[model samples]
Target: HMNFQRMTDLNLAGKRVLIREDLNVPVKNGVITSDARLRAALPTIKAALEKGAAVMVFSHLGRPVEGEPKPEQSLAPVAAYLTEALGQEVKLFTDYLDGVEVEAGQVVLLENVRFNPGEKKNNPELAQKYAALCDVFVMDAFGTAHRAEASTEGVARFAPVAAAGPLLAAELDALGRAMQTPEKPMVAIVAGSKVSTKLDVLNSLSGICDQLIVGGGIANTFLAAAGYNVGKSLYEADLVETAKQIAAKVSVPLPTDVVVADASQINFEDFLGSLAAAQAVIKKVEDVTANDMILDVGPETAKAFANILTTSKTILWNGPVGVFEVDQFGEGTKALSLAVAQSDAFSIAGGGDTLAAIDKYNVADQIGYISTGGGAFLEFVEGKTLPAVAVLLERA
Candidate 1:
């Protein structure tokens, strides 16, 4: 079992608490486009307030140039959203590093932590200032846990007490269960545009999983490695040798049939407008032509992939099998999503594209755990220790 201090076990009554939350919601025209991330942290904030703890929440918005505050990347919109969500007047503080006069049961939103000089660089002096502002520091930003920035990891070192908030602890628990101590017949679906990007993840999962499924452009590269012509597909020719080497060690399933198209013949905006458009055809992997661009897997391949997933005891999914944002190229991913949903396995899915596919297929509720972290999720599955999580473990 992992040993770490939990915020749930702390007596936070009348104490000054600082929470590093991932409130980086999508904003458009100063309006929050989505509130899902905010809702994830709501329970933690509510529990802190209910315990009469003075709450100060801080997070980084978009990447601000030179780590300075930009009007477009301001946390004002988040502060407004939190005020209404919490049903209390939540105040926003621009200069809160010195000292914040917050009372028990009151909540305040600090300006973008990136606005502080040397914050991204993990400056100890700035971290000490943040530590001085609170009696307890709660690291609740699982989305940013892989990074060792000042607010995310450094503050924990200087604070009087540092603990993992409910959201952070729960994320770690779910990921640990899926990756560290997974049940038998483990299956992992790792897909993306390039093999170089997912090389570490592929290597790590291949060692533990019963089946290491490859898809999208990555699968195209694997096909090329298997002495099959990928045609004009977006695959890395240089990685073909590496893919051959990895396939020699693990069972990287290659698609026998594929959906191919000639992108040069059709307009992408009206890609599915007519039967003559794109001229997508389903052909055997060995029958692909030099002019054909392999886009998605054929129906037979989808069924075969699903058949393998049916008996898996644990499933780890990331990225889509094809360009799923397009209507015609989404069937393979849709079928895979449904397959994972129907299985009795402990399923865990993450990454921005995978989450979008899950939402598109309406399988969010069916999956056992859908992670909020993107890069952090991949890093964790790749067997790398998260810096922020490491600090909490050290504190334990």
Candidate 2:
């Protein structure tokens, strides 16, 4: 079991609490487009405020050039959003090199932590400066726990008391159950554009999960390696040998039938290797031409995938089974989403695309655990202990 201090364990009254939050919101031309991330951290921020704690929130908005302030990456809009969200006045301290006073009942949001080059490097000097401002440290940013940046990890070392906020604690709890000690059979739906990107995830899940479902382009690689015709589906021909190696060990279920676009050969010349390998390539469909591109799993394959999901006790999904963005090619992904939502298991979903699909299919609330961390979720499941999470663990 993981050991880390939470807000309930700490006497936070009148404390100067410096919070590391994931306020990386979507903004378009100075207008805050989406406030979902902001809303997620409100519970933690409110908890600190209610304790009469002096709160100063720090976060990175986007990947801005270090030491250079890009207008588009400013946190000014976030401060305004928080003001209304918190139902209390908020302050934006864009310039705090030397530091300033943070009185009790005050909520101050510092500028982008990425404004300084030292932050990304995990410089102790910058961390010491940050520590000088707060009596206690709180990490509420699950999205950035994988990174060892100064604000997230280094500053924790200098603070007297460092604790995981409610959001972070909750994320660790849900994700831990899914990966560390899930109820059998743990079925994972692993999908994406290529086997190369998901290789680590595939290898890691192979040992742990009972029933693994391979979809999208990743399925094509496995199918092609087994001497099946995948047509012009996006796949790594080079990874065919690697797929065959894991065929027995992973026991991943591949699609037998696929939705194809035979008329639209918009990008056919690119898959010369796939075309050449098809020496009497028997497709699930008969009239499929060389111009075809497999966009999604066919109805029969979707039924089989959903049936497998229904039987599993723990369902972990990372990517969409089909090209979910296009209206015509979204059926397989939507069908899988419904299956996941209606499942009795502890269902956990991650990745940016996976979340979009859940929202598209209106099954966001049905998912047991929807991770805010995408890359971090993958790294954690891959069994690499993240640096920020390690610091919190060390404090315990």
- Highest TM-score: which candidate? 1
- Any residue pairs clashing in model 1, and if so which? none
Residue 333 of model 2, lDDT score: 91
**Best of the candidates, lDDT:** 1
Tens-digit per-residue lDDT, 1-396, candidate 1: 578999999999899999999998898989889998899889999999988899999999888864457788889999998999999999999888898889999899999987899898999999999999999999999989999999999999999999999989988988888788789899999999899999999899988898888888899999899999877788999999999999988888888788888756756576455324456678888999887777788888899889989889899998778777776777889999999999999899998889999999999999999897889999999999999999998888
lDDT of 1 at 164: 97
Q: What C-alpha lDDT values do all the predictions have? A: 0.89, 0.84
TM-score of each: 0.94, 0.91
Q: Which pairs, if any, clash in model 2?
A: none
Model 1 misplaced stretches (Cα beyond 4 Å):
65-68, 263-276
Give candidate 1's TM-score: 0.94
